[PDB]
Amino acid sequence: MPNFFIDRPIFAWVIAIIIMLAGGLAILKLPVAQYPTIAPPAVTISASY
Amino acid sequence: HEVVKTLVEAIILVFLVMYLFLQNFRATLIPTIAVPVVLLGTFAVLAAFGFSINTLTMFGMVLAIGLLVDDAIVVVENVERVMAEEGLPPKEATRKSMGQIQGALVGIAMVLSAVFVPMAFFGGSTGAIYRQFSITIVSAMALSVLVALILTPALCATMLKPIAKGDHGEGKKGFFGWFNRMFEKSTHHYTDSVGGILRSTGRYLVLYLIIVVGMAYLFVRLPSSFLPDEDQGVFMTMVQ
Amino acid sequence: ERLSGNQAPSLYAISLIVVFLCLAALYESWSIPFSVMLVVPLGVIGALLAATFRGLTNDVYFQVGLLTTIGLSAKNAILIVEFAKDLMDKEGKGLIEATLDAVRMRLRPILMTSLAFILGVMPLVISTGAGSGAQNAVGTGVMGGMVTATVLAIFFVPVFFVVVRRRFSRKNEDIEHSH
Numbered sequence A: 001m002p003n004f005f006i007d008r009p010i011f012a013w014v015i016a017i018i019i020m021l022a023g024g025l026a027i028l029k030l031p032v033a034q035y036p037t038i039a040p041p042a043v044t045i046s047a048s049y
Numbered sequence B: 001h002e003v004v005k006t007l008v009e010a011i012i013l014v015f016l017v018m019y020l021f022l023q024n025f026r027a028t029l030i031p032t033i034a035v036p037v038v039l040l041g042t043f044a045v046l047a048a049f050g051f052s053i054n055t056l057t058m059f060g061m062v063l064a065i066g067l068l069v070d071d072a073i074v075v076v077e078n079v080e081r082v083m084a085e086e087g088l089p090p091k092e093a094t095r096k097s098m099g100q101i102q103g104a105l106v107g108i109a110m111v112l113s114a115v116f117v118p119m120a121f122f123g124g125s126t127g128a129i130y131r132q133f134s135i136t137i138v139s140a141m142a143l144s145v146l147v148a149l150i151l152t153p154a155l156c157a158t159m160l161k162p163i164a165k166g167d168h169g170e171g172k173k174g175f176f177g178w179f180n181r182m183f184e185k186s187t188h189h190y191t192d193s194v195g196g197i198l199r200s201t202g203r204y205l206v207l208y209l210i211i212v213v214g215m216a217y218l219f220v221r222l223p224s225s226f227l228p229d230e231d232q233g234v235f236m237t238m239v240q
Numbered sequence C: 001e002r003l004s005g006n007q008a009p010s011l012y013a014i015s016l017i018v019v020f021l022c023l024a025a026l027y028e029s030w031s032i033p034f035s036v037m038l039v040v041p042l043g044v045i046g047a048l049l050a051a052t053f054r055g056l057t058n059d060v061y062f063q064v065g066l067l068t069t070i071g072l073s074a075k076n077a078i079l080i081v082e083f084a085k086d087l088m089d090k091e092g093k094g095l096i097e098a099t100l101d102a103v104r105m106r107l108r109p110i111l112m113t114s115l116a117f118i119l120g121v122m123p124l125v126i127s128t129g130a131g132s133g134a135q136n137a138v139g140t141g142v143m144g145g146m147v148t149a150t151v152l153a154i155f156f157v158p159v160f161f162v163v164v165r166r167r168f169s170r171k172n173e174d175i176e177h178s179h
């Protein structure tokens, strides 16, 4: 496998460019927030008398 | 169902063209078996990935037939080419044939998914319509590659009538004789001319550039739309 | 809209990028993919020629069957140069020879897939009645694209190759290799 790519440097490069392009597109789509949702969920019943 | 019927037909029309070039029932029965194997495979995938049988998936199958039959044709044709260049038994030929095109086949399945997969990434309303084709077609051609180096070579190994060195079929009497004798001769003129046009280079670059021009033109003038308005055999009248 | 429309131009950009990249890896070159990428317009010219002729629109159905034509065109291109390249590497043949020998080996299978597919979608372009609109759109585009892809390419691919080999040769060409 490394010997594979020691002979195929372009193929080596290519895989890199794809992974990068992929990440590039990821950076655009991805949400941005402070923390992930890490509080637990809650439900509240409200009544009035 | 009307689309379904077209699959069935296109398969039948394919099997006729095959008979023409391939000259023998068992040979042309090979790409004929491949196509529905894959198509049926794709219905399996769709179901897994949770899609449904809809107008776009159906056309997806339809369009898939081109990609499918080409994988099959490419494989069968190669073996047959080998058998005539180097006079070899079936099992031998396919065995060396598959060695010679296996790489290209898996390579191409990737290059192609590059042209179909991005479709799966349109956003909103527009997206889901295009996504259907994208998965279908991509799925269908994965199965196609898989099938082309699992089943096609097996069939190609067993079912192919052995062809002798130089037997290009020019010799057999009847219509198949003419077609083969014509194709052989036609082939030569094809390289005789390509031999010729290659000598120039220049004249054809502009020719190409013209095409690029025209394409750009015809494209910018041609209108756009989403989906056609089908005759549903029903309609409304409103009264105010 | 609303909420952003027109995203395709951007996707066909990464698409046209990833396609070169893969082909670059396939041929172990940056220069050879071009002699495959250049066949793209040879089928679009016919898809367009047809949809206008027959008075169609650039609709979802026209687009998808366009790609299908782009794919098959590309595939046949890919296999021709793959065959030409592997004839100046495994054997030791010249540019013109490697090209010629490849392109005749590849002619039968291409006519084979073209006729079978064009003929195969004929039911669509001829279709009337229910779902017709769809069937006609899909079928007309592909039909035209496949005709012009076939006829144009097989006289254009041989050129693309020998031209890009020559703009990117490194003085080790051209005569005849050995061994």
Ligand SMILES: CCCCCCCCCCCCO[C@@H]1O[C@H](CO)[C@@H](O[C@H]2O[C@H](CO)[C@@H](O)[C@H](O)[C@H]2O)[C@H](O)[C@H]1O
Binding pocket: B001, B004, B007, B036, B039, B040, B053
């Ligand atoms: C062979 C090569 C590739 C081409 C094959 C593609 C086939 C396309 C089929 C889509 C047609 C739509 O209709 C589809 O047909 C099947 C089978 O009759 C129906 O199946 C129905 O009939 C049977 C009766 O025995 C019931 O058991 C079943 O519960 C019921 O759903 C489906 O309700 C429907 O989804």
Ligand SMILES: CCCCCCCCCCCCO[C@@H]1O[C@H](CO)[C@@H](O[C@H]2O[C@H](CO)[C@@H](O)[C@H](O)[C@H]2O)[C@H](O)[C@H]1O
Binding pocket: A008, A015, A018, A019, B102, B103, B104, B106, B107, B110, B111, C021, C022, C023, C025, C026, C027, C028
């Ligand atoms: C998202 C992460 C990144 C993943 C992306 C993967 C990249 C895929 C792009 C195209 C793949 C090309 O496909 C592959 O190309 C090489 C090119 O040397 C071919 O390799 C073939 O030719 C060479 C020599 O010319 C042989 O030594 C080799 O053993 C043979 O298989 C393979 O037959 C083919 O399978």
Ligand SMILES: CCCCCCCCCCCCO[C@@H]1O[C@H](CO)[C@@H](O[C@H]2O[C@H](CO)[C@@H](O)[C@H](O)[C@H]2O)[C@H](O)[C@H]1O
Binding pocket: B115, B126, B224, B225, B226, C005, C006, C007, C008, C012, C015, C016, C019, C040, C058, C063, C066, C067, C070
């Ligand atoms: C080598 C890789 C292969 C890729 C090459 C690509 C060349 C052509 C292939 C497909 C044709 C492009 O198709 C393109 O799609 C978009 C989106 O639906 C269209 O866009 C149009 O319709 C849609 C939907 O109503 C809207 O998003 C948009 O506002 C409008 O301009 C373009 O007008 C059309 O030209």
